[PDB]
Design a protein around this ligand. Structure first.
Ligand SMILES: [Mn+2]
Ligand SMILES: [Mn+2]
Ligand SMILES: [Mn+2]
Ligand SMILES: [Mn+2]
Lengths: 201, 201, 201, 201
């Protein structure tokens, strides 16, 4: 198909004890697969709509496409943004580190803003550190669901899934503990690479 | 001076009779100007929040940022996507044209899908032709307001403002006439340029 | 059909000079009629879905129903909430007046909160004075489009349409002047009646 | 003390094995409690705004009010809509039953439409059976989050929480099993009571 489910770059239990393998399996094998399948279906439906010149369901198809594709993009980024603690360094280094100090003042400032954005979401959503092509800067955005509350052209660098399915089985309603534990498995090397390729657009 | 109001690449009345000069003036000078100020203000507010370590209004600020920055991005592309009748080819050619035929079957099919997405919006929004970096293809998206119903990483190639302020003074409630008339001023050279640079991401 | 387009309780030009007859005609005859037709169509589609046991388009149909029915409800209330200046009294009287002083402090306080809610909307929307059945109080709500940002059970008492089609032809981008002029045509007798029948639920 | 957390009309484990006591406890004690506090806080904030004549955060406060108050309303109806298996009739009777057959053809048709609306939600939301005062009929609505996709004046009769926290601990990703199991604890006497009082509006 057009979209395919990427494999995890590590074992399902590699992120423990911070993130359980039980969540990783359901999150990847079930939820992410669903978005991939939904994005492919939306495209097939759009294709049939053009062939028959019937765009009656255009509003539905465009939302299906945006919702599912955004879900695929967000999760694909999410998997690579993590790595077992000890494998990747903590705290941004070199160019990324400097850029963070430039646009946020310091790493602690960025972390606090990102955390506030993650825990304050009213509904399902994401906390996202993106590259703004227009302002040539790094900003934090609070996505609603998967596809709402973000400017076009935004390039994701670091994302934290705040949908309840991402943490409920282990942290229950305490989203704060989930965010705190998550900081331990952030793969700053992946975010650094994304930043390198992002700022050239 | 992080965000600035770009000047129109043509005179306010250069798009007539398709889009009146009265609309171009109010649209650029008043509306677009507002989103630039709002985007700048949101960043200043976020910087103040970090300085005082008070992220109590993070939800408001993240939406102020997304809404205004997206408005700024969308209108910035919109102005360049247009040019006086006779300035550029009335139909895509070369790689852009071949890509359109590849992802939509034909130029007419693309126009039909884009038009349906533009006229069907339930509320304020945009019809948008974007480059999908993940699927490596061109898709049409239907934005709600300025910042909703789109995947992160979407590169805008061609956009049509469907907010009522974009056409009400001239076309009133007849959205169909506005869209049909708009096709006459589309600058395919701009779109082709955006496509060339998008594919290299 | 199930839903019908209500006739205006006054001539199209009765609200002048505050609201032009040109806007009243388009707003009522075109925009409102569209919501009535759309709500009826949504119900017919839902009926067919049940007959054939095909709920594939349920997400589309539920949004179509909510969007259009909310549009019908909001506009129906909107027409009755207005009357030619001099016909209806200015400032709430008796029970309504007391309730407003109780839940807002004073009439000026309510008017200021309502005005701020009306002019600050980021996209299409409504400023609404509703009766809260659960808290047994009058609150101001800011609707997005027609059907978003409101609790179920909310009973509208006074509504102000902030969609651009409601004021653009006369006030252009200056929504502030539109709200200020609108206060002159509010039919406080209609709001009083709605309040009388609302607080018994 | 404007908004208060209602107590469950039954023990936390009274709905087992359909809905676990663990979920009922967290759902009522933690989640519902949060919306009550948020709704109270929003009103206090709005009162403070009026006192100081500063409505700068009106957009944030109106959403805080709508989101939290709607969460409060939705969960308040939800608890009462349920009762231990064997407490009430497993199928609507009398006027409620006749009304369901009138507006949906049959009870099974209603269940099918309600179920489709519940399982198809793209994000957090609610499946809801409401009384439409304008059309004088019973419709099914699909709420997004707590406060989106619904017309003002909608009277909630029966509601099903589709937020992940409502079923993830027990049913994981299998939404279909949660909905099917939920039908077994629906208190039709409560719904019938709400219908009787709704029709008298
Ligand atoms: Mn997820
Ligand atoms: Mn515009
Ligand atoms: Mn209107
Ligand atoms: Mn809940």
């Amino acid at each position: 198909a057009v979209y395919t489910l990427p494999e995890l770059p590590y074992d399902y239990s590699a992120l423990e004890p911070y993130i359980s393998g039980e969540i990783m399996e359901l999150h990847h094998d079930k939820h992410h697969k669903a978005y991939v399948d939904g994005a492919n279906t939306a495209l097939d439906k759009l294709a049939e709509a053009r062939d028959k010149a019937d765009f009656g369901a255009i509003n539905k198809l465009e939302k299906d496409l945006a919702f599912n594709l955004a879900g695929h993009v967000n999760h694909s980024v999410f998997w690579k943004n993590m790595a077992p603690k000890g494998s990747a360094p903590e705290r941004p280094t070199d160019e990324l580190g400097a850029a963070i100090d430039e646009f946020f003042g310091s790493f602690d400032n960025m972390k606090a803003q990102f955390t506030a954005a993650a825990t304050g979401i009213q509904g399902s959503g994401w906390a996202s550190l993106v590259w703004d092509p227009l302002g040539k800067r790094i900003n934090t955005l609070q996505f609603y669901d998967h596809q709402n509350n973000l400017p076009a052209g935004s390039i994701p660098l670091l994302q934290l899934d705040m949908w309840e399915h991402a943490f409920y089985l282990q942290y229950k309603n305490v989203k704060g503990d989930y965010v705190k534990s998550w900081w331990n498995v952030v793969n700053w090397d992946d975010v650094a690479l994304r930043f390198s390729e992002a700022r050239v657009a």
